[PDB]
Design a protein around this ligand. Structure first.
Ligand SMILES: [Zn+2]
Ligand SMILES: [Zn+2]
Lengths: 50, 146, 116, 209, 107, 714, 290
RNA sequence: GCUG
DNA sequence: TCAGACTAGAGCCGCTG
DNA sequence: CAGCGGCTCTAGTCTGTCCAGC
């Protein structure tokens, strides 16, 4: 089904709950993977959520 | 067979199908041909805007339309030909633009009709009309100024 | 052909470097779900979007959308999506993917009434 | 872009402003002119302007099939009556032209007699299209039909206006070279106009209320 | 060709008179004697195309080669992909394989 | 160097949704009905006169629609709120009050407020009690500030008039017949008559067809009946190229076989073909003046302006055989959208005419029979014709108006309350015209013309696929303009009256026609100066901003459209590679110094239309701006609509997945509103502990979904 | 399988041209047994298949060419003594396209079904020119019928088969050989079986009605088998041959190819209640009463 | 109208 | 909405006597 | 010189368009 957006929503949300943010998922924009990967490692989780 | 009553081939500029054996002009070129190349007088026929920039003089009105029937004889304006073929009709403080109208190729006759008597009168043909001019307001300049 | 050749070349490269244990690769190899097209389409390059077996027909006068010049027969003007689903589709590319996709719903609906 | 050529003065003439008509012939090319053709009558109604003309066509020229001309004249007119008759002779002598009116108002149209260095405008009272009439064929059918055997109100309103008859003076006749001078206006070379003093912003508000 | 009467502007027809063929009006006496050769060439379009077709290069100007089919595994191939049925949430492909001219066509 | 960016440009979208969009499309049609169109209906029907016993007459002076009221048992009346109507199962309606002038022997007796019926008042319109309230005062009315309105309450059920998609009347379609011939047609709907007329080439010769003719008739006879008698002037209009003449040739050769050489003979021919509903001449002459091509005006039985139009049709059929440029009905410039107010206008005109004719019947019975007393019609003004005509049509959804041969069904639906999005979603739906007749797969496809107007993804999955569609977030539907200054401007921009010329000019390459709503305004040379100047006059506010102008260079016409029902969308104006909108302007808008209307006036933003963005070149982003760009897209996420705006990262998903969420997201359990506990409904689902989404669009913030969310983070 | 056929594209019968119906509309066309279908295609094998010069000759014997396609002009001539329409043949283009036509043959292409034109009225004054002297139609027409012929005379067929819209050459790609087969998009199988230089024993047709009319019921029976199996294999379905065999035997056991329509079922099935429980439920019950 |  | 393969008619021309 | 007759052609018309749930 190639629902890659579900895979990003899980990652952006996880980086969001850990620092009190709502990450945006707007079409043709939104918060990028490169930004949320660095939020997870700052809080001690793996950058790809595994 | 009569050479002046041949049958009409359909494009009126191209009437001659049987014989004894165009590009488009621009208003700068039309006025240049009738001044330098040929001194002969010619009847133009021009379409002015619905209102000219005047007031009807003492005509008892309301900001109603102004037409050439309301004005008085004399000089009414000046016609300027500029470089690059632009032509303007300066008809007051305002300048109106002048462009060539549709190129008619059917016959047009300019005629007087005078009912000099109750039931009879004179009809007189003053000449043929070949070219049409269109005058329009320059809405870009009129508006840009204000 | 040139575009489709670029798509084929970009797909082989991704598979070569994908490590064993990549879950998507496993499901393609064992055939349980997906295919090497699907992997290549979400990693490397979404294909030419095709409607009724052809490039996107002109739905305006001599062009597909007002964002392209008239008579232009370039790849992106007629439905070539150079992005993958990871990189995200551009406004223009998304519209093309949706259009080719919508031919999906249209065909399924037509078949049901007749096949019955 | 300076006005490097032909600053042309533009004058206004009113002496013909209630007299001048533009006639035009949609089916006759600009090279075939009615200047040679003898005209036999001119008719007008001065209000609800509807001009009619009758033009004579000759019969000794080769382009006239006299055998067919005798037949069509015999269809239209009873063979020997001649009290009322479209054609006096046994042949079709005349073509009649019937006008259609182009526009109700003509206020914005002007004829422009160009002369070297100056232009002379004159208002038009009317613009008419003249077409060859096929009514004679209908009359021939009506004579045959009798032998064999709202538009109503509006036409009766146009019948109230009495016909005005006009003498026709063609382009060759000296009266045409005479009256052509009344398209000019006597005036000084340089006059500042009392009218047309409005500004661009007053003019824009006048044409766009 | 259309030719029209200088008098009334109806359409002329060709007929025959006592000395010549004539263009003649149907509604007025006007006739025009054909004194000399007059012509009108339509100039239609020839069926030039010869068009041979179906060459192998005209078949394999599509992307795919050196892939694997589930039937005969040969490299010289001709692939196809569809998606236009959204009842099929899986993808749709069809393949042609013609190195040994085996000619499979499956899903 | 890169082209610089104005990052606050997205703010133009909240400033836009304050006035247009967000279910305003519905409200701004109903307001236009009850504040102006109800007066035009009365104005066209202002007098009634009994045929028997003349010189006695009833006159309508003015009409009012009033405020919602309930009529109770002992004739007490009190104002009512929308929620009391939901509970008690009654209709939320305001009394139509009219003032009349009439004869009781004294020839001017007046009444200043006669109630003749009751009008359903759509919520959040200009007469609803909710409009202009504060959220603390919605609480007294038991209403929710977020509830969109745009719907009626009729007998206690919430009913939405859906947006109907239509074809544009008064436009020359050129299309292929079943048999592969090419023809043309123009559905000539006017307010007095709708009719279709066709141009057929059934044997290589052109015939005109109409339902009032028992057989279709050669077009050269119709030209002759309209008084262009010479064959030359006909061919001059049709065209003077050799192949156009060769194609029209066999049609002259038909009329010359019959004895049709004269107008009277041609009118006699048409007379002997007319189906009977003076004989031969006037049942033809009136038919050409009034029913064939009825949208083209003939003033005093001058047919010149109709001859030019029927020549344009024949020429387009000829040039569509040589190459098969048949037109597509699927282009949205051709499509038109009919909203709540334009349907109710037809229904009320039918009801008001049946009211006057019923009252005329009453007068005709009693005046030459009953009594010497000069009876007053006031005693016969039974209200039930108006009230029950409105309420039955809205409740049942069938609009059988025999006056205009219309028999639509399924016009209204019950507003869905499965969730907040299910209600707001329904308010943007666009039902189509075909209505699932058969599997066509032609209009079900996503046409590129839908860009920014209709949502790509939000369509049902099922038999309705591609026939039910939803508006995008940033679209506007025009109303009908006054039409006056467009003509007065165009006649000054060098247009020439088509009556002053023969046919031949229409076949010149340097001559373009100008059309306004399908009625030719004349011809022009230098169309580029016309189109540019007309756009300048629009930008500076002299011409109304919704008037679109565009060029078709293939068929040599300039079109000016001022009719209502066409989708507009705002764009930023770009001149010489620089966008007009600036960061300072966006900052001023945020401060409130300037508003979206101010941007339109200063020529910073203008509304393009689907026929006009055919001409324009639109950059998506500032870095895509090239030498020949005319407009810049404000926010490209507004290509998606309301329901698709819930999806996080939809551009990372395969397209069918987005469509399914647009169905599922209407069905999710959630919270209907703040009044949900004081609300009694047939079936209501609520989630006990709802949470707002951890990842959200900007669209979620615009529609305020995170105030009453539907879901939980798992 | 009809529900699995997604109405795919990318199918052109191997010739980058000659589009075909496939999928559900092709199965529907076969089982309806309609006498005409969309794009009927005759495959003609050439006997002297060695080289292209022989293919283009016999292609030109089946593919239609009109008189206007080989004439460099057609002209009306009006003279004082007579008037006629004249056609000059472009004998250079004849000599290249390898057609067996000249002025004397074009006299035989005309005189058939063309307003009763007399043989005398057509003359062959040189090897490149023909003249058609017009005559009064004497039925709903005027002698000025030259304007009919001036648009009609080019569209007369001088050579080939009238039902064939086009033909194309196809080339194999196997390494072992190279031979040219001829694909005919048209609907006269008998004529293509009988032109000199087509191997008539090995040409076939899509259309079961053409094969029945030309080759009998047993060749039509095999064509139903071949065509259903061809359509199934292209969409990657597979059916055991015994099912398509039984379907074809069912449609041909009464000697005529009967459809699976209501009309074919009324010729196969005797039972009133079977017939009345499918379609036309009123008419079958009143007929059984009568 | 929507689900199947 | 879109064929669709039946059922009469209108002829048509040309041998068929 | 005239009359059947079948052809041939318009076109006319009635006949379908998945299963089921709520
Ligand atoms: Zn004539
Ligand atoms: Zn294979």
């Amino acid at each position: 089904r190639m629902t890659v957006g579900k895979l990003i929503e899980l990652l952006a949300g996880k980086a969001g709950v850990l620092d009190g943010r709502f990450h945006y998922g707007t079409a043709f924009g939104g918060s990028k993977v490169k930004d949320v990967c660095e939020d997870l490692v700052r809080h001690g989780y793996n950058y790809l959520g595994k | 067979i009569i050479n002046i009553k041949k049958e009409k081939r359909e494009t009126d500029e191209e009437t001659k199908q049987i014989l004894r054996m165009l590009p488009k002009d621009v208003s700068v070129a039309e006025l240049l041909r009738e001044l330098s190349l040929t001194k002969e007088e010619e009847l133009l026929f021009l379409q002015l805007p619905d209102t000219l920039p005047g007031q009807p003089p003492t005509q008892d009105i309301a900001e109603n339309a102004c037409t050439l029937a309301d004005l008085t004889e004399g000089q009414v304006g000046k016609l300027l030909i500029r470089k690059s073929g632009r032509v303007q009709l300066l008809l007051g403080k305002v300048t109106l633009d002048v462009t060539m109208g549709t190129a008619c190729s059917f016959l047009q006759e300019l005629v007087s009709v005078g009912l000099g008597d109750s039931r009879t009168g004179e009809m007189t043909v003053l000449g043929h009309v070949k070219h049409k001019l269109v005058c329009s307001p320059d809405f870009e300049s009129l508006l840009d100024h204000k | 052909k040139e575009l489709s050749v670029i798509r084929d070349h970009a797909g082989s490269a991704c598979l070569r470097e994908l490590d064993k244990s990549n879950s998507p690769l496993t499901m393609a190899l064992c055939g349980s779900k997906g295919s090497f097209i699907n992997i290549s389409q979400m990693i490397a390059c979404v294909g030419q979007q095709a409607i009724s077996g052809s490039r996107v027909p002109d739905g305006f006068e001599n062009r597909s959308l007002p964002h392209f010049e008239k008579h232009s027969k370039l790849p992106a003007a007629k439905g070539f999506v150079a992005n993958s689903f990871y990189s995200g589709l551009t406004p223009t590319e998304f519209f093309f993917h949706t259009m080719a996709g919508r031919e999906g719903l249209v065909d399924t609906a037509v078949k049901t009434a007749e096949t019955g | 872009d300076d006005p490097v050529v032909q600053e042309i003065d533009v004058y206004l003439a009113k002496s013909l402003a209630e007299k001048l008509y533009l006639f035009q012939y949609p089916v006759r090319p600009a090279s075939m002119t009615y200047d040679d053709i003898p005209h036999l009558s001119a008719k007008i109604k001065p209000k609800q302007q509807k001009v009619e003309l009758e033009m004579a066509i000759d019969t000794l020229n080769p382009n006239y099939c006299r055998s067919k001309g005798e037949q069509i004249a015999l269809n239209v007119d009873g063979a020997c009556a001649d009290e009322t008759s479209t054609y006096s002779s046994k042949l079709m002598d005349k073509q009649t032209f019937c006008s259609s009116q182009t526009t109700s108002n003509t206020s914005r149209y002007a004829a422009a007699l160009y002369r070297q260095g100056e232009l002379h405008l004159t208002p038009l009272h009317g613009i008419l299209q003249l077409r060859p009439s096929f009514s004679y064929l209908d009359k021939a059918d009506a004579k045959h039909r009798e032998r064999e055997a709202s538009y109503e109100f509006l036409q009766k309103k146009h019948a109230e206006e009495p016909w005005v008859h006009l003498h026709y003076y063609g382009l060759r006749d000296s009266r045409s070279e005479h009256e052509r001078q009344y398209l000019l206006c006597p005036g000084s070379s340089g006059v500042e106009n009392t009218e047309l003093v409005k500004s661009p912003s007053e003019y824009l508000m006048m044409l766009m209320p | 060709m259309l030719l029209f009467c200088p008098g009334c502007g109806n359409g002329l027809i060709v007929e025959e008179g006592q000395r010549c063929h004539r263009f003649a009006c149907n509604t007025c006496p006007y006739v025009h004697n054909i004194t000399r050769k007059v012509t009108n060439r339509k100039y239609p379009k020839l069926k030039e195309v010869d068009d041979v077709l179906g060459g192998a290069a005209a078949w394999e100007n599509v992307d795919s080669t050196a892939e694997s089919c589930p039937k005969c595994e040969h490299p010289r191939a001709y692939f196809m992909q569809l998606q236009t049925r959204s009842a099929d949430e899986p993808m749709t492909t069809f393949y042609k394989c013609c190195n040994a001219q085996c000619g499979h066509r499956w899903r | 160097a890169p082209i610089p960016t104005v990052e606050e440009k997205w703010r133009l979208l909240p400033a836009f949704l304050k006035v247009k969009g967000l279910v305003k499309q519905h409200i701004d049609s109903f307001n236009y009905f009850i504040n102006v169109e109800i007066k035009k209906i009365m104005k066209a029907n202002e007098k009634v006169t009994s045929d028997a016993d003349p010189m006695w007459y009833l006159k309508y002076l003015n009409i009012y629609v009033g405020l919602p009221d309930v009529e109770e048992s002992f004739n007490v009346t009190r104002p009512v709120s929308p929620h009391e109507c939901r509970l008690r199962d009654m209709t939320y309606s305001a009394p139509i009050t009219v003032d009349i002038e009439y004869t009781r022997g004294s020839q001017r007796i007046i009444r200043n407020a006669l109630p003749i019926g009751r009008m359903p008042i759509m919520l959040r319109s200009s007469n609803c009690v909710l409009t202009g309230k504060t959220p603390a005062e919605f609480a007294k009315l038991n209403e929710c500030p977020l509830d969109p309105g745009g719907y009626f309450i009729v007998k206690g059920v919430e009913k939405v008039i859906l947006i109907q998609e239509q074809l544009s009347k008064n436009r020359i379609i050129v299309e292929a017949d079943r048999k592969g011939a090419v023809g043309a047609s123009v559905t000539s709907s006017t307010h007095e008559k709708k009719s279709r007329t066709n141009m057929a080439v059934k044997q290589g010769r052109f015939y005109l067809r109409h339902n009032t003719l028992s057989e279709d008739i050669p077009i050269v006879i119709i030209f002759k009946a309209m008084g262009v008698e010479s064959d030359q002037e006909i061919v001059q209009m049709i065209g003077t190229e050799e192949h156009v003449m060769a194609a029209f040739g066999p049609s002259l050769e038909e009329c010359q076989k019959a004895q049709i050489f004269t107008q009277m003979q041609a009118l006699k021919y048409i007379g002997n073909k007319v189906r009977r509903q003076k004989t031969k001449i006037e049942e033809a002459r009136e038919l050409l003046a009034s029913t064939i091509l009825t949208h083209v005006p003939v003033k005093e039985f001058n047919f010149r302006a109709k001859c030019i139009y029927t020549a344009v049709m024949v020429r387009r059929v000829i040039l569509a055989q040589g190459d098969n440029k048949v037109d597509d009905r699927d282009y949205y410039g051709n499509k038109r959208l009919e909203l709540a107010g334009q349907l109710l206008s037809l229904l009320f005109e039918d009801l008001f005419k049946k009211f006057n004719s019923e009252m005329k019947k009453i007068a005709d019975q009693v005046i030459p029979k009953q009594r010497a007393a000069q009876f007053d019609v006031v005693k016969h003004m039974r209200q039930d014709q108006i009230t029950n005509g409105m309420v039955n049509a809205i409740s049942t959804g069938n609009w059988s108006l025999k006056r205009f041969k219309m028999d639509r069904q399924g016009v209204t639906q019950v507003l869905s309350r499965l969730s907040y999005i299910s209600a707001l979603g329904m308010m943007t739906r666009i039902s189509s015209q075909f209505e699932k007749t058969r599997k066509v797969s032609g209009p079900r496809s996503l046409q590129p013309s839908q860009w920014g107007m209709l949502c790509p993804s939000d369509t049902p999955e099922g038999e309705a696929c591609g026939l039910v569609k939803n508006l995008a977030l940033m679209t506007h539907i025009t109303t009908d303009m006054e039409d006056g200054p467009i003509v007065k401007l165009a006649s000054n921009l060098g247009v020439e009256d088509v009556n002053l010329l023969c046919g031949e000019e229409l076949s010149y390459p340097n001559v373009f026609l100008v059309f306004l709503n399908g009625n030719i305004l004349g011809v022009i040379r230098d169309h580029k100066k016309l189109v540019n100047t007309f756009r300048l006059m629009r930008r500076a506010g002299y011409i109304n901003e919704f008037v679109s102008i565009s060029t078709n260079l293939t068929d040599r016409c300039v079109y000016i459209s001022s009719d209502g029902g066409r989708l507009c969308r705002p764009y930023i104006i770009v001149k010489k590679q620089k966008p007009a909108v600036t960061n300072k302007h966006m900052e001023e808008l945020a401060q409130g110094y300037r508003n979206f209307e101010d941007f339109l006036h200063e020529s910073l933003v203008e509304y393009l239309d689907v026929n006009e963005e055919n001409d324009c070149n639109i950059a998506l982003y500032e870095h895509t701006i090239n030498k020949d760009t005319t407009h810049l897209e404000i926010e490209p996420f507004t290509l998606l609509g309301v329901c698709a705006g819930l999806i996080p990262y939809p551009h990372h998903n395969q397209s069918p997945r987005n469509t399914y969420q647009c169905a599922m997201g209407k069905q999710a359990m959630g919270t209907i509103g703040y009044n949900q506990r004081n609300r009694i409904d047939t079936l209501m689902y609520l989630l006990a502990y709802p949470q707002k989404p951890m990842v959200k669009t900007k669209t979620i913030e615009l529609i305020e979904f995170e105030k009453l969310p539907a879901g939980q983070n798992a | 399988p009809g529900t699995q056929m997604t109405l795919k594209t990318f199918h052109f019968a191997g010739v980058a041209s000659m589009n075909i119906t496939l999928g559900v509309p092709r199965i529907k066309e076969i089982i309806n047994a309609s006498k005409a279908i969309s794009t009927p295609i005759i495959t003609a094998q050439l006997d002297k298949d060695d080289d292209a010069d022989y293919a283009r000759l016999v292609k030109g014997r089946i593919e239609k060419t009109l008189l206007g396609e080989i004439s460099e002009y057609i002209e009306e001539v009006f003279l004082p003594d007579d008037c006629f329409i004249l056609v000059k043949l472009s004998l250079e283009r004849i000599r290249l396209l390898r057609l067996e036509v000249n002025a004397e043959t074009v006299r035989y292409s005309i005189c058939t079904s063309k307003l009763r034109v007399k043989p005398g009225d057509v003359a062959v004054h040189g090897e490149a020119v023909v003249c058609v002297t017009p005559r009064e139609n004497s039925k709903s027409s005027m002698y000025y019928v030259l304007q009919f012929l001036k648009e009609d005379l080019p569209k007369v067929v001088v050579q080939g088969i009238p039902e064939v819209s086009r033909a194309v050459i196809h080339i194999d790609e196997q390494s072992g050989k190279e031979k040219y087969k001829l694909l005919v998009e048209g609907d006269n199988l008998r004529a293509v079986m009988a032109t000199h230089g087509v191997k008539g024993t090995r040409t076939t047709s899509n259309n079961t009605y053409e094969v029945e009319k030309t080759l009998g019921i047993e060749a039509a029976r095999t064509t139903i088998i071949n065509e259903i199996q061809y359509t199934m294999v292209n969409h990657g379905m597979s059916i055991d041959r015994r099912h398509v065999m039984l379907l074809s035997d069912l449609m041909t056991y009464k000697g005529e190819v009967l459809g699976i329509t209501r009309f074919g079922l009324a010729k196969m099935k005797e039972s009133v209640l079977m017939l009345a429980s499918f379609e036309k439920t009123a008419d079958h019950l009143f007929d059984a009463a009568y």
